[PDB]
Write a protein that binds this ligand. Structure first.
Ligand SMILES: Cc1cc2nc3c(=O)[nH]c(=O)nc-3n(C[C@H](O)[C@H](O)[C@H](O)COP(=O)(O)O)c2cc1C
Ligand SMILES: Cc1cc2nc3c(=O)[nH]c(=O)nc-3n(C[C@H](O)[C@H](O)[C@H](O)COP(=O)(O)O)c2cc1C
Ligand SMILES: Cc1cc2nc3c(=O)[nH]c(=O)nc-3n(C[C@H](O)[C@H](O)[C@H](O)COP(=O)(O)O)c2cc1C
Ligand SMILES: Cc1cc2nc3c(=O)[nH]c(=O)nc-3n(C[C@H](O)[C@H](O)[C@H](O)COP(=O)(O)O)c2cc1C
Ligand SMILES: O=S1c2ccccc2-c2ccccc21
Ligand SMILES: O=S1c2ccccc2-c2ccccc21
Ligand SMILES: O=S1c2ccccc2-c2ccccc21
Ligand SMILES: O=S1c2ccccc2-c2ccccc21
Lengths: 400, 400, 400, 400
């Protein structure tokens, strides 16, 4: 229970200042350093490589706890583990023996530069062009680069160009964020998730060395189409998002209840004597706390299954598909819950919760409303429906 | 027709500047003056007395149109008519003969100072102490004094104190906002409705003269108990709120639709080619536009009944109770609609509608989430249920 | 008010026996004859042809009132007017001169035989093959032939075959239900709407004469595609369906309230003394009564617009398309309302309301759940969404 | 796994005949005997006493499995284990050492006679009169006596009367169903759950011997008041109900999907070619399947906690209350889920799924609509709200 105590104490500290910090936007440098000092970035690194030797259930629990205090920090922390999962699923034994001890000593907080802002999500234009001795040159602009600012390493994705061994192949690389040619642009100014630094990043002539490549170019595509072990990255990452949503939900419900206990007035017109005994106040907390309990218990069970399959040598398409269905289902339920709860709980608090902007309760809705659009829930719902009705497991990709 | 065209033209100009103005909060003086110049503040004053001689259906449609452009200016405009209605329902013929031509010539924009911030609503501590001549001295601070800033007259409520004829009787008056001892405080910094100037007003020995009094002390309480004609004030005012919600909903839907046509990207992962042809985008617009059509059509019929009873010399408890039930029903449907739609419409626009704070679409949710808390919709629901199941009309009050 | 009084009295009498009658299914001959004796089948025929010269709002009110007592009789009554509307929109002047006085004298109650059970709803295989002197011979089986038992005339649709003037044109005709070769099969055995007689009808060498044809073959296709006046048939008919749903909803709500008032027990475990004072019982009635009030008020407005356009010589596509959007909106709201209400109201009554099957309250859900599937509400939603987002009116058909 | 395989095979046979059997109502003797032969009634009896030595998670999964095929048989099965649970928590080791081997050898299927039909659910009037040798005489009529027909023993509750040591104290006993003076009345005729035999049972001078009593008079009240281990009976039983709802939901979803794949027609008006590819069809299955996956996964965690506490020598009120809150939440979520999906899934199948009564899909709604009224979900919601807001665990009782 040590690591979860550490996460709980971090969250408590973040709650003190989240109201003022998220107003300002920009990079939460002090808080990212506190996460560095905690050791929790090393949760999944073996004790023999200097890490904590912990499990995915602990990582997921920590993500939700931090997110309940500060959704931007929960996001950055969660994405770090999505990035680490990808690295761990593709890195060579030589890379792990070098990088993981270095990640411990240098306290790596990972960011990524992957998606783009072209005509649709499938329009990637950041190129990797071959160089002598096996290196590649990266050129182009990425969007939504969460945790790009103050990142020690960047997980970067590119498509091969002018390549003898085949163009259009996906290369992934882990590079220093201060490698020459990398310009983090700092243009993140969002409705919510305001301290995630998910702005854009520009690559001009950026050199990637062979010992920084995560597998061969195109290997990720072969791994996902085959259902090799790396195909677990998507269910892992979508369950990370799910725990952000559950964390936000719990934090909003607890913050509302504290207000209701200390500040709500009884609607004495109706003969109510204390707000905490109002039948409709109680119904609102009951409806949402009940959904939250079930979603949280369900999410713990799926997290255990992530760990079980994480430890296998081989995961069958059926095992991967079943897990993805369970994860997609959890994310759908958590999405609906957090969006409804963060808006409707005002009705259990009263008008003065909104009349004083500085109370800042709208932060929960703004954070959830921003992140839940990451990928459209309507097509997660379609994927689960296509599984149930047509017995088709979703096609492994970066999003399913 | 002409009045509604003027309202439409006002709304158009407000839409240009609302995003910038509402961020700043404070008093929309230029826009209040444009409303003064439009003549619409006199909509319900008879032509005999210099007004437009128009009807409540026209007022309500004008409220919704302006609210759809700028919710604070729709609120200010609507509340002016709630203040006017109270004056019209309690003032003597002699008072109206003087006040109403004055309001036309001087372009009066009314505000109010009524509710307070103590243990529960209508736990009132602002006192009216009788003076030998029949004047009253007012002392205390009012809260939520919408339209208090830049008001030509304030509708004010107090409770008698040191009164041989009975303490605790509610008096009302219409007084100049710069009467000695009136301090309008400018302490309004809210989630939404940011330019309604609903801060506090402090009364330091404010004298109210006998010709400014509206009825006799406790007369409002007796009219409420009687369910007689002055008790129409509440259904009238609750239907004003309803039209703020319908206007916000219509404005949000049309603003989201503009973004969907111009900015949303197709989810090519699912093979869709234009976002405006996505089946799930279309379902969101259809579900909410459909509910809006029915709600608006229903509201027009209730507004018609408001006009009918407004014109009568006498109104029975049964007519008043039936109207209040119809108004409550409209408010319930409009409340649920606007709260769901201003949040869920993000799902038809995509992540970039939230990723870019300056788009500012969240203004609709913030405005509606703030105002819908005015009084709890749960007890409007109880009131309709008590009528339908038990044949009990609501107990008339400032809220029912 | 005379016509509505007659409908109200018919509905009262139907309420007495509906529970026993709908159990058995089959043909409600005594109740159909009661409608014949009432004269209401002639609501839309002019007084100068023997009819009542009434209006569509009267018809719609009578439909909802009768449906609230007996959904099957309300369906039969309403479909009579859909059949009549089709006849009136396509019939020649000499057809109207002979048919309408005859329909009064002989107290005609119309049925139809239109849809079929092939691969999809567009797949029509009942043929019209040319005979000498301009007659046609009809062959094949129709499905869902509402009101076909005890019908004085059937409205019948076929597609031309072996026709030198063109194959696959849609012809419509009004014929005697006992013409040689017409076999009403009596196979309607439904979850709800159990006395609408909507089973199959088999046509074996059935002769149709030129003076029974409603326009030329293919004329309905042209009138709908061009938006000429007969394109009103679909919004007229879809609003008929809407009033079935509103009538069922009102009937179920009122029947539930009676049980709650006289049989529901207080949940004394929570200190409730009377079920009628339970806060959650009151909340259920309030929610649904409020939505019904708004839906009914909105439906009245749309019914008036039907009458207004019914009286026009020409109706533009904007006028027809805006009416169809308003009708579709009303139907969507009424559909959601009646399906939720007829199921959820058990929670306001208690277990014994379901545990005593004889109480029969499930009739409302059975009737509503059956009819609301007539055409899919999801595509009504898409049609409203396509209009609001893309400014595309529904393309006229038998369904839109 | 062996045990779950046996339950799956039973369910598969029950599925073949449930549609025909449940119309008839009455007692499903052949199916009860198949359950007797399966051994599964002994799931919780230790191997030492001739039982299967299985756990509550296995029991709950078997209940859901059987319920998905035949809700009445799942109900009868599940209530057997609620009856067994009461016996296990209150009987002496000496009693269980005789009864449990006898239950194995004689293939006991337990029923109960507990609730009554007086002014409210707390109003109990079936009396137990103490006789001088320590026996009691039971007199009066019980209602809702699930499984009272063909029962090998009945768990019976009464209140002491003519008792010098205190009237009104609750006594429980396990007695033969054919003891002199027991009359099972066969008056069950319900909307759903039609073969649970939950009719009335009348007791005329029925003798209960000392060694048939479960604890001492009032002992159950003392256990509830102290939140001690016997008060686990409620969360155990409420989670049995929860698995009936999850079972019905899964059965209904799977039956609907078979129709959608086999019989639904594409809505060609809108350009659909396959119903199984319709976007709104897929969205219904996706929404409901996703909620079911999360609810089932959360339910498994709670079932493990039931087993954990079942094995404890002592249980604190905090452990009992935490478990009850988790069970209540699962029940709330499952109730809402099954009620919505058993009605809305028609929209995925089409009109002919309701127009052909013999398809019988309404059985799912009828079963779930009937059972979910067992106790009011509104007060389960209040109980979870009171815990979350005010940190008050539910007051232990037969319902909470
Ligand atoms: C945006 C807004 C404007 C309001 N304007 C007025 C007003 O002009 N006059 C008034 O008496 N109360 C006004 N109220 C207050 C309500 O009557 C009520 O006192 C308040 O919403 C209750 O606060 P509570 O739910 O936090 O207890 C306003 C409330 C809001 C939210
Ligand atoms: C708060 C937030 C953070 C995001 N972080 C990342 C990220 O770290 N890496 C990435 O590839 N995409 C990230 N995305 C983007 C999604 O993968 C996707 O590209 C985008 O949300 C689609 O935008 P649209 O719906 O407006 O078309 C993020 C999106 C949001 C809203
Ligand atoms: C299908 C069904 C089965 C029931 N079985 C039992 C039972 O076996 N034992 C029992 O004590 N109560 C049983 N109950 C009853 C509840 O304990 C409770 O008394 C009842 O649902 C209250 O009915 P009301 O809401 O109409 O007041 C059953 C109820 C239903 C609906
Ligand atoms: C209760 C009921 C009555 C119906 N009556 C008629 C009718 O009178 N004339 C007609 O053409 N179709 C009638 N329909 C059928 C619809 O036009 C449509 O063909 C059918 O609901 C589609 O079936 P599906 O959803 O199973 O594919 C009726 C349908 C129902 C459910
Ligand atoms: O889910 S994101 C994403 C979407 C599409 C392609 C790559 C990535 C990526 C990498 C790291 C974290 C998060 C994400
Ligand atoms: O609804 S508000 C209110 C609540 C309670 C007492 C008085 C008043 C008042 C007067 C004018 C406008 C608005 C309001
Ligand atoms: O709406 S039904 C229908 C569907 C499709 C083709 C024709 C018809 C028709 C004719 C009369 C009444 C009802 C209907
Ligand atoms: O939940 S039921 C119930 C309600 C109230 C008192 C006793 C009982 C009882 C006993 C056995 C099974 C089921 C039930």
């Amino acid at each position: 229970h040590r690591a979860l105590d550490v996460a709980t104490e971090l969250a408590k500290t973040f709650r003190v200042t989240v109201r003022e910090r998220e107003r300002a936007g920009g990079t939460p440098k002090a808080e990212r350093d506190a996460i560095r000092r905690s050791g929790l970035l090393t949760l999944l690194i073996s004790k023999e490589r200097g890490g904590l030797g912990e499990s995915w259930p602990t990582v997921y629990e920590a993500i939700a706890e931090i997110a309940s205090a500060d959704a931007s920090l929960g996001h950055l922390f969660g994405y770090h583990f999505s990035n680490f999962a990808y690295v761990d699923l593709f890195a060579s034994p030589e890379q792990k023996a070098r990088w993981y001890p270095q990640a411990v000593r240098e306290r790596w907080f990972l960011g990524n530069a992957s998606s783009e802002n072209n005509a649709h999500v499938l329009d990637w234009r950041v190129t990797a062009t071959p160089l002598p001795d096996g290196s590649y040159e990266i050129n182009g602009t990425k969007a939504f680069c969460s945790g790009s600012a103050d990142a020690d390493r960047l997980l970067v994705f590119a498509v091969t160009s002018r390549d003898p061994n085949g163009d259009g192949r996906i290369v992934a690389a882990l590079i220093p964020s201060d490698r020459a040619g990398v310009q983090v642009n700092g243009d993140w100014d969002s409705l919510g998730m305001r301290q995630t630094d998910s702005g854009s990043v520009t690559f001009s002539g950026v050199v990637v060395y062979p010992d920084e490549l995560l597998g061969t170019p195109g290997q990720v595509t072969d791994a996902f189409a085959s259902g090799s072990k790396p195909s677990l990255w998507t269910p892992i990452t979508q369950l990370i998002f799910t725990h952000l949503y559950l964390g936000i939900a719990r934090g909003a419900l607890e913050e509302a209840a504290h207000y209701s206990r200390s500040h709500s007035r009884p609607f004495t017109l109706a003969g109510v004597e204390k707000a905490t005994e109002d039948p409709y106040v109680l119904a609102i907390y009951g409806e949402f706390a009940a959904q939250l309990q079930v979603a949280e218990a369900g999410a713990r069970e799926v997290a255990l299954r992530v760990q079980e399959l994480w430890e296998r040598n081989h995961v069958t398409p059926e095992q991967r598909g079943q897990l993805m269905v369970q994860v997609a289902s959890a994310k759908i339920v958590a999405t609906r819950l957090v969006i409804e709860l963060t808006s409707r709980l005002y009705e259990a608090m009263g008008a003065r919760a909104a009349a004083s902007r500085q109370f800042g309760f709208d932060r929960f809705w703004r954070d959830a409303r921003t992140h839940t659009l990451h990928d459209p829930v309507a097509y997660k719902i379609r994927e689960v429906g296509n599984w149930f009705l047509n017995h088709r497991f979703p096609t492994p990709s970066f999003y399913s």
